[PDB]
Amino acid sequence: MKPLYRQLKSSHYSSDYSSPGYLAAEAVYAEIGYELDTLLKQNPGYANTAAVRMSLALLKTGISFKGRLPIKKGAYKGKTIEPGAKLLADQLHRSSSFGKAKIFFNAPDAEKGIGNKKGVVFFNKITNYDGGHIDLIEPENSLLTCHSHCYFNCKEVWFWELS
């Protein structure tokens, strides 16, 4: 299956404090049975939580992929999380669930290509930001809004439309 935008959103923990769907990074990891501080010590990359948030949301709407972090607690125990944005984007890109992304190389193209659609967005090689960002995007007042944050100052914008 391919998830519905509304339900993927409902199942997605925003890292934006002012979002109705906000959840702190430590609670996200606690949910799947990890202490954030232990993980950061093992690999500081875990501070970038976008792919973990998206992974978990995808799982809850029934999309499974290979990942590299086993969930150790809760309903999804035994399933895997992909903590790397690029690696998650690659999964989606080859999945039959989503298919190939539309890939944009500048902000005008990205914005016109997304248009009034909604879906999954991946910001690749973001200026002054490490690890990329994968998120949900939709229109809001003729602008585009991301559930956590948009990073249009980047080298590539990948987009998968959802209904």
Numbering used by the authors: 1 to 163
Sentences from the paper on this structure:
Some Gram-negative bacteria target their competitors by exploiting the type VI secretion system to extrude toxic effector proteins. To prevent self-harm, these bacteria also produce highly specific immunity proteins that neutralize these antagonistic effectors. The opportunistic pathogen Serratia marcescens has recently been shown to utilize T6-dependent secretion of two family 4 amidases, Ssp1 and Ssp2, to mediate antibacterial activity.
Isomorphous crystal structures of Ssp1 (at 1.85 Å resolution) and the active-site Ssp1-C50A mutant (at 2.2 Å resolution) reveal the overall enzyme structure and details of the active site. The protein is a monomer in solution but crystallized with two molecules in the asymmetric unit, each consisting of residues 1–163. The root-mean-square deviations (r.m.s.d.s) between least-squares superimposed Cα atoms gives an average of 0.3 Å when comparing the four polypeptides in the crystal structures. The copies in the asymmetric unit are therefore judged to be essentially identical and neither mutagenesis of the catalytic Cys50 nor crystal lattice packing interactions induces any major structural changes.
